[PDB]
Amino acid sequence: MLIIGERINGMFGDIKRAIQERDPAPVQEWARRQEEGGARALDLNVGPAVQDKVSAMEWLVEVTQEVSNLTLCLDSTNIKAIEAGLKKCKNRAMINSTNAEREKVEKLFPLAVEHGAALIGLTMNKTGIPKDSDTRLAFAMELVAAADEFGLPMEDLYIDPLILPANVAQDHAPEVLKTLQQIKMLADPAPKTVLGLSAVSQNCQNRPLINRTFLAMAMACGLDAAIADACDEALIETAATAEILLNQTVYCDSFVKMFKTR
Amino acid sequence: MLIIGERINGMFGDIKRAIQERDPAPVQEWARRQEEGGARALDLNVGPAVQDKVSAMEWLVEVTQEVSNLTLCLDSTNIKAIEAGLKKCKNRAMINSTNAEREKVEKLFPLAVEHGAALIGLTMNKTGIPKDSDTRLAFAMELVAAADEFGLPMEDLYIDPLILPANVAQDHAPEVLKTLQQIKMLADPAPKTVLGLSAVSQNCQNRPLINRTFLAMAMACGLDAAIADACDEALIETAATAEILLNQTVYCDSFVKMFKTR
Ligand SMILES: CN1c2c(nc(N)[nH]c2=O)NC[C@@H]1CNc1ccc(C(=O)N[C@@H](CCC(=O)O)C(=O)O)cc1
Ligand SMILES: CN1c2c(nc(N)[nH]c2=O)NC[C@@H]1CNc1ccc(C(=O)N[C@@H](CCC(=O)O)C(=O)O)cc1
Ligand SMILES: [Ca+2]
Ligand SMILES: [Ca+2]
Numbered sequence: 001m002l003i004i005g006e007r008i009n010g011m012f013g014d015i016k017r018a019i020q021e022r023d024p025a026p027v028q029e030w031a032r033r034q035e036e037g038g039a040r041a042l043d044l045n046v047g048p049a050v051q052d053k054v055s056a057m058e059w060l061v062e063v064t065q066e067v068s069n070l071t072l073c074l075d076s077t078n079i080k081a082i083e084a085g086l087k088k089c090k091n092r093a094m095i096n097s098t099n100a101e102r103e104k105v106e107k108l109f110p111l112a113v114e115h116g117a118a119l120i121g122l123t124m125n126k127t128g129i130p131k132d133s134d135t136r137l138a139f140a141m142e143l144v145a146a147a148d149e150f151g152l153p154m155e156d157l158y159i160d161p162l163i164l165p166a167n168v169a170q171d172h173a174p175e176v177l178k179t180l181q182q183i184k185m186l187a188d189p190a191p192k193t194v195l196g197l198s199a200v201s202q203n204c205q206n207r208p209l210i211n212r213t214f215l216a217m218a219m220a221c222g223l224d225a226a227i228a229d230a231c232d233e234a235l236i237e238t239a240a241t242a243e244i245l246l247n248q249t250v251y252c253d254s255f256v257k258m259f260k261t262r
Numbered sequence: 263m264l265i266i267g268e269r270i271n272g273m274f275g276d277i278k279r280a281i282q283e284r285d286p287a288p289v290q291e292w293a294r295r296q297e298e299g300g301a302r303a304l305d306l307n308v309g310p311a312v313q314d315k316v317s318a319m320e321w322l323v324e325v326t327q328e329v330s331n332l333t334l335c336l337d338s339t340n341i342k343a344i345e346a347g348l349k350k351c352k353n354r355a356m357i358n359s360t361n362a363e364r365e366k367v368e369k370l371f372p373l374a375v376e377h378g379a380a381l382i383g384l385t386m387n388k389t390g391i392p393k394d395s396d397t398r399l400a401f402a403m404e405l406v407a408a409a410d411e412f413g414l415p416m417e418d419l420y421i422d423p424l425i426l427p428a429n430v431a432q433d434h435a436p437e438v439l440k441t442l443q444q445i446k447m448l449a450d451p452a453p454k455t456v457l458g459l460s461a462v463s464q465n466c467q468n469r470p471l472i473n474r475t476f477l478a479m480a481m482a483c484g485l486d487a488a489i490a491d492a493c494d495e496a497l498i499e500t501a502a503t504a505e506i507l508l509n510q511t512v513y514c515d516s517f518v519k520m521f522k523t524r
Contacts, residue, residue, distance in 0.1 A: 166506055166513055173507045177482050181443075200507070205515040206499075213503040216475050217482035220439055241468075241475040244428055247436050251429045253467040 001215075001239040001248075002041055002225040004073050004094070005034030006198060008060065010047015019050050024063040031068045038239070038260040039230035041094060042068065044085070045075035057081040061088045073120075073227065079107055086115045093117040096227075097160065100125040100139040109150040120158045120194055121146075123179065129162050131171065133178035136161045140183050144191055154189040158225055163195050163218075165202040166210060173200065173214065177221050184222030197228035212238045219246065236260060263501040263510075264303060264487035266335050266356070267296030268460060270322065272309015281308055281318050286325040293330045300501070300522040301492030303356060304330065306347070307337035319343040323350040333380070335489070341369060348377045356380035358489075359422065362387040362401035371412040380418045381409075382456055385441065391424050393433065395440035398423050402445050406453050420456035420487055421445055427464040428472055435462065435476070439483045446484030459490035459497075474500040481508060498522060 007030045010016050018026040031042055042064060046056040057076060064072060073094035074085040086093055097120035098108035112119035121143035123136040130136050140159045147157045161179040164172040180193050200214045201207035212235050215226060219242040229235055240259035243249040252258060269292045272278050280288035293304055304326060308318035319338060326334060327350075335356040336347040348355055359382035360370035374381035383405035385391075385398040392398050402421045409419045423441040426434045442455050462476045463469035474497045477488060481504040491497055502521035505511035514520060 170506065170509050170513050174509050177508075204513070206518075209499055209503050210507070213478045213500055214507050216478040217504065217507060220479035220482045237468075237471055238475055241471055242479065244432070245435045245462075245472070245476050245479055246439075247432050251432050251466070256468065 001219060001223070001243055003037075003039045003230050003236065003239055004041040004043050004194070004225055004227040005030075005037075005039035005070075005230040006043050006196070006227045007034055007229070007231065008042060008064065009045040009075070010049060010056075011045070012047075016047050016049050019046060019056050019060070022059065024066070027060065027063050028067045031064050031070070034230040035068055035070055036260075037230035037233070038236045039070065041071040041073050041225070043073040043075045043096065043227045046081070053078050054081040054084045057085040058088045061085045065090050071118075075227075079104075079111075082108075083111060086111070086117065089115075089117075094120060094158070096120045097122055098143075099123075100142045105143075105146050106150075109146050109152055112156065113150055113152050116156075118156045118158060119147075119152060120160055122160045122162055124162065129164075131175055133175045133182065136175065136179040137182050140179065140191075144186070147191065154191045157191040158194040159183055159191050160194050160196070163197065163200045163214070165204065166200050166214075167202075167204045177217060180218060180221035180223055192224040193222055194225040194227065195223060197226045208232055208234055211235055215239065216242050219243075263481060263485070263505055264456075265299075265301045265492045265498070265501060266303040266305050266456070266487055266489040267292075267299075267301035267332075267492040268305050268458070268489045269296055269491070269493065270304055270326065271307040271337070272311055272318075273307070274309075278309050278311050281312050281321065284321065286328070289322065289325050290329045293326050293332070296492040297330060297332055298522075299492040299495070300498045300524075301332065302524075303333040303335050303487070305335040305337045305358065305489050308343070315340050316343045316346045319347040320350045323347050327352055335380075335382075337489075341373075344370075345373065348373070348379060351377075354379060356382065356420075358382040359384055360405075361385075362404045367404075367408045368412075371408050371414055374418070375413050380420060381414060382420045382422055383408075384422045384424055386424060391426075393437055395437040395444065398437065398441040399444045402441065402453075403448070406448065409453065416451040416453050419453040421453055422456050422458070425457050425459065425462045425476070427466065428462050428476075429466045439479060442480060442483040442485055454486040455484055456487040456489065457485060459488045470494055470496055473497055477501060478504050481505075 075096040099122040123139035201210035337358040361384040385401040463472035
């Protein structure tokens with residue numbers, strides 16, 4: 001399980017201000033803390049508030065790699081900002097993301113290959129986020145074929161079925177688990193899977209509990225990565241424990257510690 | 263998710279003495295505590311220490327139903343003990359258990375049917391516990407066929423893949439999840455599944471964490487019931503959260519309390 005730190009996101013007040021005032025301190029501190037928690041990748045989202053998003057992404061990249069060697073997950077719907085971020089990246093990167101829309105596929109897949117970066121693909125297109133697992137799977141397969149079409153190693157493709165809040169979109173959770181399981185059954189080399197975990201508990205009571213529980217469930221269905229709260233110790237425990245229960249990581253009494261220091 | 267209180271088991275020192283001394287207090291207290299925790303079924307195991315296991319099982323049934331209306335899960339390898347127990351039960355019972363051995367099947371399935379009781383079936387026989395999910399599933403299918411043969415409603419059949427410690431039999435864990443998953447399919451009306459959860463963390467560190475992490479993972483694979491620590495609040499939280507994430511129970515802010523007071 002690859003935990004992709006979610007905190008460096010412009011939606012958060014302290015990050016929005018840091019980006020605006022170009023104050024590296026807050027961002028660099030969240031990079032450190034998240035890595036200390038066990039994250040091995042860092043999601044970098046400038047947010048919708050900042051004016052120049054291209055320049056902002058570049059900045060987030062430069063200030064972050066100054067204090068971290070972790071993989072940078074460039075999170076933005078602005079492809080120009082993504083490209084700009086990649087050109088500044090000193091370490092392996094992740095593109096977050098592309099969807100099944102053909103127009104975006106032919107821009108992001110080649111872009112991912114050009115930079116040897118990982119690519120996150122959402123199971124959806126202009127038509128919207130499908131509920132039924134069969135439809136989500138269909139989009140996933142289109143992404144799979146795309147990885148082969150453009151020469152992207154299947155292992156660098158992370159398919160995201162898009163989890164939603166369990167209190168107002170509850171019927172989506174099981175459809176997500178089913179999609180992940182179907183994707184897990186694909187032949188070698190099979191693609192990977194990811195999820196913006198925290199969305200499952202939006203507006204719910206005891207979000208950490210919901211987050212933990214779903215992470216464990218998702219991992220049982222093949223989940224390989226999760227953009228989530230790397231500073232949530234209980235969550236990190238689950239990640240570590242889940243790997244053990246899937247026999248992905250050999251057991252030892254300090255399995256939690258080993259996960260955070262590997 | 264049906265939590266079957268595991269605590270009234272002769273292997274525990276206090277229960278062993280209570281049975282040997284015929285002191286109802288310890289047993290009745292544990293019965294009430296487990297129900298309050300959220301259990302809706304109580305496992306009753308006289309343990310190996312007591313000499314007369316048939317009258318010990320009758321006693322457990324007597325002192326327990328005296329204070330509890332909960333379904334009683336008669337846990338014994340001695341069929342005479344199970345029979346004597348069933349005859350003492352005033353409420354519907356559960357039989358734990360029968361394995362896939364034909365000789366055992368033709369005695370227990372008819373016994374469960376006669377008493378209108380639930381029956382637990384272990385995916386194993388005289389050759390032992392199969393590690394590979396293929397063989398676990400093979401025995402699971404025999405049990406399903408036997409239920410049809412003897413007239414046991416498929417919903418009263420709980421198949422147990424038999425989980426083992428994650429520190430010495432770690433490769434069994436993923437096989438158990440796969441088996442549960444394949445069982446979840448088969449054909450409607452599909453049978454139910456159960457597990458002696460606590461075995462997964464035996465002799466491990468951070469046992470509660472390992473238990474609840476696996477419970478969640480198991481539930482995503484269709485687990486229906488679990489013999490476990492109904493007095494472990496964190497375990498109960500996981501069960502309640504898992505039902506929500508599978509859309510088996512409608513979300514509401516106090517879903518945990520609702521699960522417990524259900
Ligand atoms: C849509 N999510 C997502 C993605 N990328 C992919 N590939 N998939 C996804 O599902 N990128 C962004 C987001 C994941 N990150 C996050 C980050 C924070 C919160 C969150 O819980 N935010 C708080 C904000 C609190 C504040 O404003 O101070 C919230 O309550 O909404 C959720 C998901
Ligand atoms: C084999 N388990 C089991 C079953 N029935 C079915 N169908 N399936 C199962 O896996 N019945 C009994 C047991 C379930 N109950 C339990 C009860 C206690 C512990 C446990 O953790 N015991 C302690 C011993 C504590 C003491 O002796 O004081 C241990 O660490 O071993 C595990 C499972
Ligand atoms: Ca996987
Ligand atoms: Ca089931």
